[PDB]
Amino acid sequence: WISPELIEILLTILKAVVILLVVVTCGAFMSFGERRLLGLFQNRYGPNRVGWGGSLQLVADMIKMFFKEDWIPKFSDRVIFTLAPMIAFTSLLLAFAIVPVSPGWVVADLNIGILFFLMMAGLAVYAVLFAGWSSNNKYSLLGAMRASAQTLSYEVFLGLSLMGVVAQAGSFNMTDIVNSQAHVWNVIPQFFGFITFAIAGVAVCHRHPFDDGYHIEYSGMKFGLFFVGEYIGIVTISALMVTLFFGGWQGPLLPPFIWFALKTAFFMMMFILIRASLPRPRYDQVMSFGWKICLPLTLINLLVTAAVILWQAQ
Amino acid sequence: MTITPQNLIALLPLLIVGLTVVVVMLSIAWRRNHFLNATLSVIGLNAALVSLWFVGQAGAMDVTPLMRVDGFAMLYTGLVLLASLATCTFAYPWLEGYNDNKDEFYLLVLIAALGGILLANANHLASLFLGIELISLPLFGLVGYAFRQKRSLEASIKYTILSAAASSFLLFGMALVYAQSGDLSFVALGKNLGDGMLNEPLLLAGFGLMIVGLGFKLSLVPFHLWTPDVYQGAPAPVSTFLATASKIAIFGVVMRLFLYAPVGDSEAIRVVLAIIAFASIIFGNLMALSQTNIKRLLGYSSISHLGYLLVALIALQTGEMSMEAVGVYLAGYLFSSLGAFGVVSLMSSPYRGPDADSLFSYRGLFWHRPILAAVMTVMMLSLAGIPMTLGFIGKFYVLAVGVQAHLWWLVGAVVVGSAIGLYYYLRVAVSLYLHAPPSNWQYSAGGIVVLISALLVLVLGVWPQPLISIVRLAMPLM
Amino acid sequence: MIPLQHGLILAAILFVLGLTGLVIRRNLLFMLIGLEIMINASALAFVVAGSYWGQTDGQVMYILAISLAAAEASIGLALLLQLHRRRQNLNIDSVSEMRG
Amino acid sequence: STEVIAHHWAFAIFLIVAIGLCCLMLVGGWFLGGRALRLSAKFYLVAMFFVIFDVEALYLFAWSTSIRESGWVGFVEAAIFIFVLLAGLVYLVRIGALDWTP
Amino acid sequence: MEFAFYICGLIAILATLRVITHTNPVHALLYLIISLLAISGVFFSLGAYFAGALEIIVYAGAIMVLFVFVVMMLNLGGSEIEQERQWLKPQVWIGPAILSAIMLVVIVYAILGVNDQGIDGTPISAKAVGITLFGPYVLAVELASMLLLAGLVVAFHVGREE
Amino acid sequence: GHPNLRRIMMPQTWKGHPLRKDYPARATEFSPFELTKAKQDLEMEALTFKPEEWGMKRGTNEDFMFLNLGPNHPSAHGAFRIVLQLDGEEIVDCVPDIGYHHRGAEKMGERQSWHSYIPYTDRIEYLGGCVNEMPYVLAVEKLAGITVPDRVNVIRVMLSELFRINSHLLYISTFIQDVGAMTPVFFAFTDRQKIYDLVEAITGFRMHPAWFRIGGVAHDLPRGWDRLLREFLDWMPKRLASYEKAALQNTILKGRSQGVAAYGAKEALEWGTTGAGLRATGIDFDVRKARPYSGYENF
Numbered sequence A: 001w002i003s004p005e006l007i008e009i010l011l012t013i014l015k016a017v018v019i020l021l022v023v024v025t026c027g028a029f030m031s032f033g034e035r036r037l038l039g040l041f042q043n044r045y046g047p048n049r050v051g052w053g054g055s056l057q058l059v060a061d062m063i064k065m066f067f068k069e070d071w072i073p074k075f076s077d078r079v080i081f082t083l084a085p086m087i088a089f090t091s092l093l094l095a096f097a098i099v100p101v102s103p104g105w106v107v108a109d110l111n112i113g114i115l116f117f118l119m120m121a122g123l124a125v126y127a128v129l130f131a132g133w134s135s136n137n138k139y140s141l142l143g144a145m146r147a148s149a150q151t152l153s154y155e156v157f158l159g160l161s162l163m164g165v166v167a168q169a170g171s172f173n174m175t176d177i178v179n180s181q182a183h184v185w186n187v188i189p190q191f192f193g194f195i196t197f198a199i200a201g202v203a204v205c206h207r208h209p210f211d212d213g214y215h216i217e218y219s220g221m222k223f224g225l226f227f228v229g230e231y232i233g234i235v236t237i238s239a240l241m242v243t244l245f246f247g248g249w250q251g252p253l254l255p256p257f258i259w260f261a262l263k264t265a266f267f268m269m270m271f272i273l274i275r276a277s278l279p280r281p282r283y284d285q286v287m288s289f290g291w292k293i294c295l296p297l298t299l300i301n302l303l304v305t306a307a308v309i310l311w312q313a314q
Numbered sequence B: 001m002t003i004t005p006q007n008l009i010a011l012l013p014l015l016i017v018g019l020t021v022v023v024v025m026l027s028i029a030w031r032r033n034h035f036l037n038a039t040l041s042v043i044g045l046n047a048a049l050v051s052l053w054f055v056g057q058a059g060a061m062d063v064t065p066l067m068r069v070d071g072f073a074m075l076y077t078g079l080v081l082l083a084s085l086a087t088c089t090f091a092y093p094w095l096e097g098y099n100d101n102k103d104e105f106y107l108l109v110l111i112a113a114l115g116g117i118l119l120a121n122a123n124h125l126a127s128l129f130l131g132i133e134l135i136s137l138p139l140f141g142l143v144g145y146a147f148r149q150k151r152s153l154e155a156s157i158k159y160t161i162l163s164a165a166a167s168s169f170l171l172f173g174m175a176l177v178y179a180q181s182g183d184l185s186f187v188a189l190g191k192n193l194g195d196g197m198l199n200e201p202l203l204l205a206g207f208g209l210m211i212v213g214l215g216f217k218l219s220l221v222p223f224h225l226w227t228p229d230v231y232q233g234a235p236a237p238v239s240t241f242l243a244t245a246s247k248i249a250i251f252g253v254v255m256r257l258f259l260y261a262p263v264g265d266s267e268a269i270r271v272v273l274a275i276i277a278f279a280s281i282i283f284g285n286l287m288a289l290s291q292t293n294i295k296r297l298l299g300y301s302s303i304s305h306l307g308y309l310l311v312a313l314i315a316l317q318t319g320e321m322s323m324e325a326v327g328v329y330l331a332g333y334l335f336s337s338l339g340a341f342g343v344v345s346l347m348s349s350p351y352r353g354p355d356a357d358s359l360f361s362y363r364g365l366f367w368h369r370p371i372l373a374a375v376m377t378v379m380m381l382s383l384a385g386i387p388m389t390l391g392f393i394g395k396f397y398v399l400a401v402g403v404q405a406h407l408w409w410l411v412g413a414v415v416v417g418s419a420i421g422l423y424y425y426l427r428v429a430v431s432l433y434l435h436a437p438p439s440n441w442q443y444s445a446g447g448i449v450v451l452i453s454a455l456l457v458l459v460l461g462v463w464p465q466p467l468i469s470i471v472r473l474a475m476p477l478m
Numbered sequence C: 001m002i003p004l005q006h007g008l009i010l011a012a013i014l015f016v017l018g019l020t021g022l023v024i025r026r027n028l029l030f031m032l033i034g035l036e037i038m039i040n041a042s043a044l045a046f047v048v049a050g051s052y053w054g055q056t057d058g059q060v061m062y063i064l065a066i067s068l069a070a071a072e073a074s075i076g077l078a079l080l081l082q083l084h085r086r087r088q089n090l091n092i093d094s095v096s097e098m099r100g
Numbered sequence D: 001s002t003e004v005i006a007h008h009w010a011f012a013i014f015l016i017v018a019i020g021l022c023c024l025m026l027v028g029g030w031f032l033g034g035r036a037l038r039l040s041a042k043f044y045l046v047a048m049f050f051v052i053f054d055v056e057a058l059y060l061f062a063w064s065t066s067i068r069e070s071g072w073v074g075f076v077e078a079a080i081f082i083f084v085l086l087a088g089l090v091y092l093v094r095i096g097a098l099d100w101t102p
Numbered sequence E: 001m002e003f004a005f006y007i008c009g010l011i012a013i014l015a016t017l018r019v020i021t022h023t024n025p026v027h028a029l030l031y032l033i034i035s036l037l038a039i040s041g042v043f044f045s046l047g048a049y050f051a052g053a054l055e056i057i058v059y060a061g062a063i064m065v066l067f068v069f070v071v072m073m074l075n076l077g078g079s080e081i082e083q084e085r086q087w088l089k090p091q092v093w094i095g096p097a098i099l100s101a102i103m104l105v106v107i108v109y110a111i112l113g114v115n116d117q118g119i120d121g122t123p124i125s126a127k128a129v130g131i132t133l134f135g136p137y138v139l140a141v142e143l144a145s146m147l148l149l150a151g152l153v154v155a156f157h158v159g160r161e162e
Numbered sequence F: 001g002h003p004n005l006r007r008i009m010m011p012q013t014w015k016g017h018p019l020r021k022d023y024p025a026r027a028t029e030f031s032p033f034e035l036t037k038a039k040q041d042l043e044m045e046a047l048t049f050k051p052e053e054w055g056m057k058r059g060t061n062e063d064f065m066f067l068n069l070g071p072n073h074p075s076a077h078g079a080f081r082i083v084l085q086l087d088g089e090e091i092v093d094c095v096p097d098i099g100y101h102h103r104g105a106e107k108m109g110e111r112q113s114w115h116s117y118i119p120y121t122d123r124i125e126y127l128g129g130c131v132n133e134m135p136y137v138l139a140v141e142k143l144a145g146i147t148v149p150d151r152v153n154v155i156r157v158m159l160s161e162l163f164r165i166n167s168h169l170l171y172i173s174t175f176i177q178d179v180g181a182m183t184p185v186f187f188a189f190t191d192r193q194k195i196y197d198l199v200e201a202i203t204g205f206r207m208h209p210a211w212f213r214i215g216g217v218a219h220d221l222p223r224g225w226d227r228l229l230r231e232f233l234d235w236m237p238k239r240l241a242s243y244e245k246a247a248l249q250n251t252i253l254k255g256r257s258q259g260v261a262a263y264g265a266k267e268a269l270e271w272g273t274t275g276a277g278l279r280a281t282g283i284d285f286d287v288r289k290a291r292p293y294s295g296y297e298n299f
């Protein structure tokens, strides 16, 4: 069984497994880190007693949610009710599956790339829809329709915000996108694309300030699946933002994974700071902002990016 | 192939109608004004109609791998634009009584006219498909424009479901044809076959499924059962547009497809089309025998007249005057249907609410509306193919084309269907003169349109040579 | 090394399944669902034909097909909502008042 | 090539292990621990707007990956497409189609 | 490549057969989404990568979302749909199923008599599709924008509430 | 002539009238059967809802849905039901269901001595404390014919203003939290802790000091209170300016708050609106100036 091809195949599979495990662990520790960083932003400490510095707290909520009684509503659709947290977890996990965290460390070097990310987000809206419908609660159903209408209103320009970076790279591939940032990171030319992508990524992840609730019926381990999937989506959106707008792993002195992890941690911290800092706008205001401001901004940014690209191609 | 400025000159009515769509849309966004938006729509359609002159002096060219502009496309573009302008003219006094928004009617009419122009210029399966749906979907809106009315909602639902089904059939047939041939241009459908192997089963199956879709679109038997319901339920200007522009554009693109495709010379396709034409003529004439509703009667009339047109289409590969017959017949049928549906629209206008019936009651029309009764009896005599009317000149062209190609079964079908049509058309025409128990310039404009259609029908019925010379001047590429 | 006939057969199977669902279902919603199955099957047939010939034309026809599918779904669901508003049922056999 | 088949195997293992991990999490949650209004049409309108503008977005997606090959002619065509898109959006906003509050 | 093609095609066939015979609308839409994902896998096995990406992005990510949305707005509890099961009666479906089977046999007989060198599965990227789209298919793009505009106007005119 | 004369404190199926002199004040024997019966009415209220007992009309135009927002409210203002008649998102009509926090405080006023009732006066407006004690002890002093000395007036004014700042800090922080900004409530409760340090030093208690007396206060001021007051007075203004700049000048908060639920002077007058809601209409009516008490003229 000793052959270089099989050794390389096993090494690549092991690298993908390591990436998956580190991402799920980082999502759970991101829940713990949201509690700690909210404590830091609010002049307090957060959980710092369960283990050293509170580091064993996440294990305590994991044990609590595992050994909590598993409960499904009596007049609920069991398959759809169980299926919603599956989607909420797996959709943005599989969206992470295209992220290049280091040169040579990627799971899938697809030719579609951020198209696969858009595939995953368009599937991810079904978690909210299914959680609202299957719970057999009219408050949960109304909240799910409002949340899904908001996410459609921002998913309508998520891809168009990425299209300026795609146009500059000339490709959908993520390695080509981070290689086109070898001199200047895409946050400088695609700045309006960057802010529109930030707004769309926060809105489709159901984060503050885009957060009658469609999770009130969930409990035990399904609620934990919803939360861990939300934090995995935070990590995935931050890593995609780093790769598409901040050079990915490229940096002057540090190893490439150190630069990627530092930039992803910075945007993770900015997610927490955005929750701690901004008030919640009204629903109609949020959706009018999504439709009237951001979508024309993405279209005009794409037009100007194309004009600059074709003018610079002598 | 790229686009040149000369290609842009050949693109002129399409560009003008699309610009009119955008301009009318932005004018509705500025402020809802029925008169201004209707005026902008008719100004754009008239601009496209007069830009056909610059298209003619641009010459005949291939503008895209998809479009081909020639005299054929010019004639069908002019017919589609005339039908759209008449639809807007009939639509304004009807929409004067409409309580909800009226401006979207003209936007949908303009987009459907754009689809008709694309079908006039279509040289490709992609452009044929796109032109068909660009006609169909604004007609989904227009047929159910008065969706509060029960009949209009019924007609809208029926038309939408059946047209989506026919679109699926047409696209599946196009996909099978593309799988056989490897190119989607009209001239390459059957070009990879030789030594008498033109009847390839996959190409024939694909063309059969496209025949299903197009025969839905042309109200041909046995895809005809939607026609009286959708004609009756739709608003009367929408019925005018659906009778004239949609049928004319789809028949023109079918004419071009069967002219250019080498598989149009197939014997099996010819026999299937002969069966469809025979059944369409006989069934449409028979089913209108006992109709007291003028709209359902005109729908069955449309089935019969499209059967006669298909008879002219069958002799395309054999005779030389088949497309000239199609042009003359389509001009006459357009003017006759414009007059008949316009009299119906003028007598149904203004829109008197969704809860009040829009029944015609044509009996005794001469004693309060004598000019409209004269126009409608001229149209009834024209649709019967009676001499001194242009419909007779079209029927004469169809019969000459059939006799030239020795299509004797279709010739006998035309004669028998003409006798049955004579019965019910004369019944309507004489009911206009029996005894039974407006005031703005747009209504007068609609009356002027139907009166001009009647005058044209009579004058070209007794002197058809200018129309014949114009149609012979519109020669497509050999 | 996938036969073109196998892809066309799969597309035809999906097409006739969608047409059967369109015919046998009294609900307008299931009729729209069957229409979507039919147009998606036809678009798959175009994709198979384009992939056999190595041309982008199959995917371009797919793009036009799904543009039509999206707009037709929009219009059909609007008409279905209007029907549910003005009749409180989706029985398509009840929408039959014009005949003869 | 060995690299592409290794990456295909890694992607397959990624999807399999992610789905299996979530399934095992649900199974362990079930096994462990002891036991004991009419929606408005604006929702449809917003979802319909999303569908239509997402199809126009796919057209722009196809344009964006091949901008340099299409040249300035493709820029003019996409500018016409985007202008039609923006005119439709302006029309939707001005007639109150995109106003949630009346 | 072929193995994925046959499994995805079988999954699409079985899911569509589950769709057209189901009584619950949300379950039927879920099976339809599964069939669309399977058809996207079929597209990816044939090298049509942009087609598969748009199959998930638009067909299974926008159109089915609209269908699901409308089903929630109706609150379809199977009123006179589940309580009748008219399509499950053999006297109702035996006719249309025989008609569809006859049409399938005719189409398959036409299909089997065509030249077939096989599908190579060479990936046709979205770059080539966009080159063709804004080259030889420009008027298709602009009039497709007009078609989507018409669909928008029609659906807004019909689907208002007042 | 009353449009709907139903019970507003007690439930509808209550026998007798509690404030009558022959009604016994004390708690009755608890019965699990009555609790189960009232639970059954709670579960059957969603089914047997009649939209005419509550004073409404047109109980489902076939689109007017109904919503309930209680009686489990996760907020500091308490828990109470509002049943909403909705046209989409618009509130056509709404009646509030109150009495879920009825403590019988007036009836207890008839059951406690003049001195032993003061802790009950604390718990009327439980964010007010000494502010709640002040009108009761002033009215009892009017009954007793007592004029308190000036130092009593200044002490009671100081404690009233400390508790007014405490209540206003809670109100502003909870409003900012209700808008959506979750951070300033932590710092506002730190400022409340500074106030509570001074109040604990003076009265021995935080929220219900019960420190005012008929004729004065319970104790003298402890030695060193001025240091705590000076420390709080140095602490407060920069924190207040920081809250203003961080949340109250936020345009998202302004869009959530400006123009929402507006009324004028006539509407405030006809509904008995007092406090900041009345004075925001331009009507200058504060009791501390219009009808001065407790030596407020000397400030």
Ligand SMILES: CCCCCCCCCCCCCCCCCC(=O)OC[C@H](COP(=O)(O)OCCN)OC(=O)CCCCCCCCCCCCCCCCC
Pocket (backbone or CB within 6 Å): A168, A169, A180, A184, A188, A189, A190, A191, A192, A297, A300, A301, A304, A305, A306, A308, A309, A312
């Ligand atoms: C009221 C009606 C509506 C009015 C309009 C409202 C909307 C406005 C939207 C504006 C959008 C502007 C987008 C500008 C992008 C221009 C930069 C760009 O795309 O450059 C591309 C180029 C890299 O491409 P290339 O060189 O081809 O690389 C591959 C090599 N073959 O990149 C480079 O070579 C590097 C170029 C760097 C340029 C940096 C400066 C421009 C971008 C940052 C703008 C910051 C604006 C800050 C706020 C201003 C006030 C709002």
Ligand SMILES: CCCCCCCCCCCCCCCCCC(=O)OC[C@H](COP(=O)(O)OCCN)OC(=O)CCCCCCCCCCCCCCCCC
Pocket (backbone or CB within 6 Å): B016, B019, B020, B023, B027, B033, B035, B036, B039, B040, B043, B044, B047
């Ligand atoms: C950017 C590229 C080029 C684009 C195309 C060229 C520019 C297009 C500009 C369009 C302007 C639209 C707005 C016009 C406003 C007119 C205002 C006015 O005078 O309104 C009077 C009247 C209003 O209606 P009424 O009810 O009668 O009012 C009674 C109260 N006085 O209304 C009337 O009586 C009707 C007045 C009609 C005036 C306009 C007539 C010409 C329209 C030309 C464009 C039409 C489409 C062209 C297509 C391409 C042709 C090559």
Ligand SMILES: CCCCCCCCCCCCCCCCCC(=O)OC[C@H](COP(=O)(O)OCCN)OC(=O)CCCCCCCCCCCCCCCCC
Pocket (backbone or CB within 6 Å): B289, B415, B416, B419, B420, B423
């Ligand atoms: C020498 C023989 C071989 C050559 C033949 C050449 C053709 C010309 C000579 C033969 C003509 C025969 C015509 C027979 C029917 C005459 C029309 C007629 O009777 O119309 C009146 C009748 C309506 O009156 P009524 O009976 O009151 O109806 C009650 C309904 N509420 O109307 C009706 O009931 C409906 C009428 C429908 C249309 C008339 C029938 C058309 C049949 C085909 C005509 C073409 C000839 C084909 C060969 C036929 C057999 C010879």
Ligand SMILES: CCCCCCCCCCCCCCCCCC(=O)OC[C@H](COP(=O)(O)OCCN)OC(=O)CCCCCCCCCCCCCCCCC
Pocket (backbone or CB within 6 Å): A086, A087, A090, A091, A094, A109, A110, A111, A123, A126, D004, D008, D011, D012, D015, D016, D019, E033, E034, E037, E044, E049, E123
């Ligand atoms: C709860 C579970 C629900 C179902 C989950 C999914 C079911 C299947 C799970 C097993 C999958 C086994 C592995 C599948 C193949 C992986 C490799 C692959 O896709 O390779 C093909 C292609 C490679 O591209 P490349 O090689 O770079 O191209 C150059 C030419 N060689 O790459 C591509 O073409 C990439 C595009 C295809 C990627 C598909 C990924 C899964 C999509 C479905 C997600 C479903 C999410 C959960 C449910 C949502 C709600 C329904």
Ligand SMILES: CCCCCCCCCCCCCCCCCC(=O)OC[C@H](COP(=O)(O)OCCN)OC(=O)CCCCCCCCCCCCCCCCC
Pocket (backbone or CB within 6 Å): D004, D008, D012, E001, E003, E004, E007, E008, E011, E034, E035, E037, E038, E040, E041, E042, E044, E045, E046, E047, E121
């Ligand atoms: C295992 C038995 C069945 C078990 C139950 C069903 C589980 C899901 C099975 C379907 C999806 C996985 C199919 C297996 C894919 C394995 C990878 C593979 O075959 O890759 C080949 C090919 C790679 O690309 P290519 O470049 O052509 O490769 C040639 C080598 N140079 O690959 C390709 O070109 C495309 C790869 C497949 C397409 C992407 C994934 C599609 C996922 C569809 C899910 C549909 C919904 C499933 C719902 C299940 C529950 C009901």
Ligand SMILES: CCCCCCCCCCCCCCCCCC(=O)OC[C@H](COP(=O)(O)OCCN)OC(=O)CCCCCCCCCCCCCCCCC
Pocket (backbone or CB within 6 Å): A197, A198, A199, A201, A202, A209, A237, A238, A241, A267, A268, A270, A271, A274, A281, A282, A285, A286, A289, F251, F252, F254, F255, F256, F258, F259
């Ligand atoms: C990894 C990716 C993510 C990483 C995290 C970093 C990015 C986070 C992005 C957060 C985006 C939040 C967007 C919130 C938009 C809210 C729009 C809205 O509805 O505003 C309403 C408000 C008032 O509206 P109006 O109609 O005027 O009502 C007045 C009636 N009296 O209108 C207004 O107040 C007008 C201004 C509205 C807001 C403009 C946009 C602000 C965006 C948030 C600040 C971002 C700053 C940069 C953060 C760091 C980024 C690296």
Ligand SMILES: CCCCCCCCCCCCCCCCCCCC
Pocket (backbone or CB within 6 Å): A018, A019, A020, A022, A023, A026, A101, A102, A105, A235, A255, A256, A257, A258, A260, A261, A264, A265
């Ligand atoms: C929040 C970041 C999540 C990252 C998930 C994937 C982690 C992969 C770790 C790979 C580590 C090795 C990378 C290659 C070597 C270069 C760096 C060496 C020093 C770490």
Ligand SMILES: CCCCCCCCCCCCCCCCCCCC
Pocket (backbone or CB within 6 Å): B374, B375, B377, B378, B381, B386, B387, B388, B389, B433
């Ligand atoms: C065959 C071509 C058309 C010929 C002319 C058809 C009739 C056109 C309208 C002329 C005016 C009709 C007036 C009829 C008056 C009838 C009065 C009857 C009194 C009993």
Ligand SMILES: CCCCCCCCCCCCCCCCCCCC
Pocket (backbone or CB within 6 Å): C093, E095, E096, E098, E099, E102
């Ligand atoms: C209330 C209205 C219900 C209408 C149901 C219509 C059902 C039609 C079923 C048709 C069945 C055809 C069976 C096959 C016939 C022979 C093969 C085709 C002709 C050669």
